[PDB]
Design a protein around this ligand. Structure first.
Ligand SMILES: [Zn+2]
Ligand SMILES: [Zn+2]
Lengths: 114, 114
DNA sequence: GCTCTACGTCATCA
DNA sequence: GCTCTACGTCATCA
């Protein structure tokens, strides 16, 4: 009777988190902890975490869910990533939340003087 | 008995020009007219004619000969292109020889000031 | 006189 | 709050 790792109560896991992201997390807990379980588009991963296309395109590094592009079925598929994996990678790359914020400040300056 | 299109005499065609570039040209005529038949590396194509990697990577646009990279067999293969095909594409792209030199003149400032 | 592309950005088009 | 890549550069690393 395997239980959700957040609540330890539910036995029915969120189908995407479980099947695509290998996380034994129920839907309710996923909505309760978006800090860990929210899905981010490829574009949002680049904005929020400063990850690059080669990193996000690496099939071996992140699990990901693809959907039809909401703008047209003929455009490139939308790619969804789970915040806990992307963040963990980004913390490693930039040095914790501190390093990430520092990079953000640096980026903000290049924005100001341009 | 088919003849070289430059001399109208030789029947033995240069093996590369014939087999890879589909040009019925003898080796001797090829050295007598480098303006048309000299082989240019991918890097030289970019320097000389300002073609881009997507143009030069298009399997459908240019014939090409590949060789082992002379720096190391483990590096990416050297790619050779025949001057008459690359020049002809470039004259379309930039508008003849004189559009090409205009672009040459233009770029000479971008690195002169920089 | 060798080739690939990320770099740090972004528009555009898809 | 969509994605891919050309931008023209070029330095590295292959
Ligand atoms: Zn739960
Ligand atoms: Zn000849």
């Amino acid at each position: 009777a395997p239980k959700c790792i957040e609540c330890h109560i539910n036995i029915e896991m969120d189908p995407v988190l479980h099947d695509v992201f290998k996380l034994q997390v129920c839907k309710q807990c996923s909505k309760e902890h978006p800090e860990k379980y929210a899905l981010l588009t490829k574009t949002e991963c680049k904005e929020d975490y400063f990850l690059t296309d080669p990193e996000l395109n690496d099939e071996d590094l992140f699990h990901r869910l693809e959907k039809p592009n909401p703008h047209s079925g003929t455009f490139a598929r939308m790619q969804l990533f789970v915040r806990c994996e992307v963040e963990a990678f980004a913390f490693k790359k930039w040095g914790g939340e501190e390093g990430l914020d520092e990079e953000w400040q640096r980026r903000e300056e290049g924005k100001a003087h341009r």
